């Protein structure tokens with residue numbers, strides 16, 4: 001209910017969404033909810049950075065009024081037009097029709113598309129343009145595809161405060177607002193789940209953007225994302241983390257995702273695992289119909305190997321395995337080795353689909369025609385799987 | 399615990415599985431459990447038709463012993479070798495090593511593969527062969543791919559009793575054993591869910607098999623499947639039902655499955671529905687992340703149209719939609735008209751994948767380049783969808 005000061009004149013005025021469990025419709029699971037962060041910069045001219053998910057507009061406005069009641073608002077920065085950030089746009093614009101919109105070109109187009117019965121003063125911004133608010137100013141950095149075509153970061157030079165919007169965020173609901181009030185390991189784990197399921201496809205753009213910011217030699221003292229905790233005590237950790245994850249070097253770890261109807265594919269999954277562990281590799285084993293797809297993807301971010309298994313039903317793969325595959329193809333895991341495996345009763349069929357989808361995900365198969373068994377595995381079948389796991393381990397080496 | 403008499407000398411000695419909720423691993427959902435039916439025919443020579451899911455072997459044996467204890471068993475018929483029917487094979491074989499196995503060739507192969515440290519006296523049966531037990535006898539009917547390559551039905555002429563194994567079964571747990579002790583509508587609905595998720599791919603084989611049984615002019619007074627209730631009062635209903643379902647004529651019904659992240663694809667789904675209802679069609683609308691895939695498939699059995707929608711995320715379809723698509727490709731719905739639809743933000747990508755998978759399922763698209771919208775639908779976009787639903791309705795005619 002109460003706004004939170006990041007520093008004098010700069011306040012957090014977002015909303016905490018405790019009960020949300022799924023974001024992007026079904027796409028992302030938020031075991032602990034999330035927050036919609038919006039920032040108010042007070043000065044000779046006051047600016048509001050981003051808004052809030054429509055169902056929480058009241059909270060935004062209520063918090064704005066607690067800072068100054070007849071909400072002033074000279075500028076309204078729109079870093080991103082998804083809906084969790086621009087949903088309260090109409091309400092804000094209705095509250096301050098004179099507010100001046102600062103956004104990218106693609107942003108402006110999206111804004112007219114999603115709302116379009118709303119007129120407003122504006123100025124298309126580009127990397128480098130800067131508006132003054134008086135004592136402080138806000139300069140912009142375009143971030144195309146750093147999630148969306150309209151993405152962009154807002155920087156406040158006078159404070160060395162970066163407002164990346166989605167980048168560097170984590171989906172987690174807390175009544176506490178800063179990284180120094182939360183467990184280091186838990187918040188970094190949420191940050192990894194976030195990156196892995198949303199930013200993985202743009203890892204190359206992440207490094208480029210990190211370098212650009214590196215060259216310009218931007219002084220970042222605090223990072224305030226649009227979701228989750230604000231990195232005020234140690235922005236370096238999250239920046240180094242993004243660099244490591246975007247580089248994609250990985251860790252001597254392997255993730256095995258699979259499912260079975262009668263356990264054969266499972267026994268193969270187990271043999272593969274034993275080989276991988278014997279080869280000195282950490283293994284995470286996921287039976288898909290009982291695991292969370294987003295938690296599996298999070299593990300794959302650091303993995304150097306991805307093994308996916310499934311029996312064949314009606315000449316196709318088991319439907320529970322489909323989500324993970326179509327999700328990998330779209331997420332485009334970087335620098336990963338893989339293997340497909342599974343049982344069958346007569347003609348087979350799942351192995352081709354598995355390898356097809358794994359290659360479409362640009363995952364290099366450690367073996368054309370991966371392990372396959374008819375009905376049940378026998379001693380040598382499991383031995384071969386064990387050797388294969390040992391082979392993958394040798395390659396993931398480290 | 400107690401065996402149940404179907405008629406003197408013929409007993410049900412299966413097991414009821416009340417707490418099972420997922421069969422075939424993740425594949426089939428059993429909201430109300432299931433049963434594993436096994437039958438004991440007592441005569442000069444006693445025969446046991448099928449066994450039970452391994453975890454319930456003790457129930458089988460306990461029931462056998464209540465009929466006659468030293469378990470006699472001269473013949474052991476194995477109509478099907480999946481594990482829910484042949485899992486207690488070892489235990490039975492160890493209880494009566496002299497038991498004579500009567501099965502198909504493919505069955506025999508499967509049996510040696512799944513067990514193979516178990517020897518037994520046997521005789522490969524073919525359609526028409528018949529063994530005598532004394533007063534009664536059992537004749538066999540091969541039923542390749544009527545689920546499995548090894549499938550076959552067992553017929554007892556003296557009683558006009560058919561023991562189809564999986565065919566005509568329903569996954570439902572009850573303490574009551576016969577169709578006349580259960581609600582006609584509820585049991586027929588379970589039977590439909592069963593057929594749609596398992597037998598749909600073999601509808602052509604179903605009618606051929608039904609005709610062969612028709613020509614031979616077999617007298618069927620009772621049908622005892624390997625799962626669910628025994629059709630003792632009205633086998634005709636279930637046989638007529640299978641005929642109608644296998645035919646695939648359908649009903650003037652349309653099923654719309656989809657999901658969204660921000661509601662645009664949903665608004666399209668709605669428009670399409672209004673057109674279909676206006677055109678005099680019954681509609682079932684399923685938001686996939688909140689519906690049971692097996693229940694959706696069940697509705698498609700009767701439907702003449704299948705509309706699938708999805709936005710595009712990372713140039714791909716939404717992962718929750720993948721299961722239904724890979725499941726339709728394998729199930730091969732017969733004589734269905736379809737359409738793919740969905741929103742997108744810039745490049746799109748889901749529409750291609752949807753149409754590709756829909757065609758792979760041999761579902762005739764009522765429009766290559768199905769309804770697609772960028773960002774949000776506008777008045778004419780919804781009008782167009784409405785017209786399309788109107789068009790499909792016209793074709794689904796009736």
Ligand SMILES: Cc1cc2nc3c(=O)[nH]c(=O)nc-3n(C[C@H](O)[C@H](O)[C@H](O)COP(=O)(O)O)c2cc1C
Pocket residue numbers: 259260261262263264265266310311312313314315316342343344345346347348349374375376422423480596
């Ligand atoms: C409903 C059902 C459908 C099946 N369809 C096929 C099929 O089209 N092709 C095949 O080669 N095997 C098929 N099978 C056999 C399985 O692939 C085989 O039993 C395998 O051993 C099971 O693997 P799992 O123990 O890892 O679950 C099918 C089995 C079931 C129960």
Ligand SMILES: Cc1cc2nc3c(=O)[nH]c(=O)nc-3n(C[C@H](O)[C@H](O)[C@H](O)COP(=O)(O)O)c2cc1C
Pocket residue numbers: 024025082198657658659660661662663664708709710711712713714740741742743744745746747772773774
């Ligand atoms: C994480 C995320 C990833 C996206 N990826 C793409 C993409 O690759 N291509 C595209 O054309 N649109 C993409 N979009 C935009 C959606 O397809 C678009 O917003 C659509 O309107 C959402 O449909 P809906 O309202 O039915 O959920 C993406 C949106 C989100 C939130």
Ligand SMILES: [Zn+2]
Pocket residue numbers: 001002
């Ligand atoms: Zn409050």
Ligand SMILES: [Zn+2]
Pocket residue numbers: 054055056
């Ligand atoms: Zn509201």
Ligand SMILES: [Zn+2]
Pocket residue numbers: 117118119
């Ligand atoms: Zn106007």
Ligand SMILES: [Zn+2]
Pocket residue numbers: 270274
């Ligand atoms: Zn082990």
Ligand SMILES: [Zn+2]
Pocket residue numbers: 399400
């Ligand atoms: Zn009992």
Ligand SMILES: [Zn+2]
Pocket residue numbers: 452453454
């Ligand atoms: Zn047991």
Ligand SMILES: [Zn+2]
Pocket residue numbers: 515
């Ligand atoms: Zn042995």
Ligand SMILES: [Zn+2]
Pocket residue numbers: 672
């Ligand atoms: Zn309506």
